[PDB]
Amino acid sequence: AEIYNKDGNKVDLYGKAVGLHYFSKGNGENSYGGNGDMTYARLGFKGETQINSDLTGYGQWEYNFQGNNSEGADAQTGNKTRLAFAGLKYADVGSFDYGRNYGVVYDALGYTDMLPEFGGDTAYSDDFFVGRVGGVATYRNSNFFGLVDGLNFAVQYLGKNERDTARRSNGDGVGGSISYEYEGFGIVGAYGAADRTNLQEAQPLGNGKKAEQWATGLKYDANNIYLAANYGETRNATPITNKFTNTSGFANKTQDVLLVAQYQFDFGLRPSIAYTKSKAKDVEGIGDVDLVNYFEVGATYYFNKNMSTYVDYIINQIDSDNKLGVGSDDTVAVGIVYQF
Template identity: 60%
Template sequence: MMKRSLLALLIPALLATGGVQAAEIYNKDGNKVDLNGKINVGHLFSDDTGNDGDVSYARFGFKGETQIAQDLTGYAQWQYNFQLNKTEGADALSGDKTRLGFAGLKFGKWGSFDYGRNYGLVYDALAWTDMLPKFGGDSGYADGFLSTRSTGVATWRNSNFFGLVDGLNVALQYQGKNDRTGTDAVRRSNGDGYATSVSYNADSGLSVVGTYANLGRTQAQNNAARGEGDRAESWATAIKYDANQIYLATVYGNTHNATPISGGFANKAVNFEAVAQYQFLNGFRPSLAYVSSRGKDIENIGDADIVKYVSFGANYYFNKNFLAYAEYKVNLLSDNNPLGLANDDVTGVGLNYQF
């Protein structure tokens, strides 16, 4: 039977390129630097032109640590994304972007504090189902009220609750106002706000987490055709089992004025995701998932599906650094969905090298 520590080495989350895959390039006198990266070459097949074609990309980054005192450590992380499906000389809209960039201090049992571009705490729950071979992660979006990667966030995390309760983790986060302009003025702006996360990880492989975020909305967002209220609010709960080569996870949550749709935001969205995977010892990892997000009380529409699909897929790990993947997304949106969203099935295939 495969031990959980070996599984953690073999199956890194595809959205991250750090952790166990990092290549150590310097470690001396309390200073350590690890490089990490990935090249993902892939292709989508669909009758929807927006989900058809080459989707290859590369990511590169580093993690650094320096020992300042016995219980005080400085650390930093940076990661950049390069789109490989664009022409040479493509402009800034090519998709190249800084995904992460933050620095902070660890204070022993008192936890860590960092600032910069980092994951919002709502993702502490959403990450557990964001494990699909190609698709997934539909309940959050970048620069979206602390649901995934966000700019200008101050984060405090504490593991094992000050050393008193093994497996109990707490976190608090603050984000300042980002009043963007142009095409990002509505979708990617935010006012001042905060988020919190509480999780418990048992030795049996069973874990639970709850997250909550509440942020102000900007004037541009309040002036949009859809979405009312001065605050954007979201909460999510998740449970997972990760042991004995089995991975099961489900997430349920609500958002208010925080899920983007055409013309602004849904006044309310109900999100549900579930995934089941099994790791065979030969490297084969099949995956089955259901993902849905349903908007409520949308102006001039009422209730409508925003995301709804079933996914069948698999990863095949040649070793801990190289894998092949394939996934078929059965789109369950009806032909007459009132938001006019793409409702064609999509197939994704590709290869992934990471270190």
């Protein structure tokens, strides 16, 4: 919501209250997404300032607050700052910003990240370029300097984060993306490579001094029709773990595939069907394993831009022989979102 707009500075304060529950068999512990209360809320601000006719400054922060913890010792569980960056935009030169932000490969992966609740499984946070990460400097160019409508590109420097856990760490890295869009049709490619920390290399899963990710996507998006596909691969980048005695690390390689179909009726209903498969390969002591394998069926109903409800059923194709212990049961999310 734009709550402030005076003297060339505007501030959008935004957020939402998601009442949300997951239904899964027994424990949920061997299901796709777990079981129980999942209610949370978001809060954030974007600001933009007109510096002059061509120059623009901006900053943005967004925070997650779980609503399914007690007021006791677990109050903070799942609470995090999702985004925090500032930058500048100049006329037809492009934008530069720095802070915690989405990695370039997410420009690709965003194509199928459209399910009511789930999906976008390959866009892990703090995982190099595939989702939100700390310490990205990002340059982006719009319509190729104003010369070429619908063509964009970005380049990114991700600095190293030697965190406590191998899972959240990364070395210095470089990435980019290009996308073209014409009359509801778009295509995208993105690639990034980065060094692994010593602590990542120390883990029993994953071997090698460079993590790599790339993804391509192709989409149809107009006339109330949404269709999109993603195919990606990774090397040494996808976090994996055993379920029982935690040995963790990274997948030596993965193959990712995301298919999405959705239709937007004028009265507000939007059915959605989607299929997602992700498989690891050359995992040590395992060989090949599926990490994600499912079909999805569900629907969102928009009352208006502020209020919605949705159902998301995950038909989980993993099965309980899975060598990594990936849970095999299904999951339904029912939810109700107010947002401003």
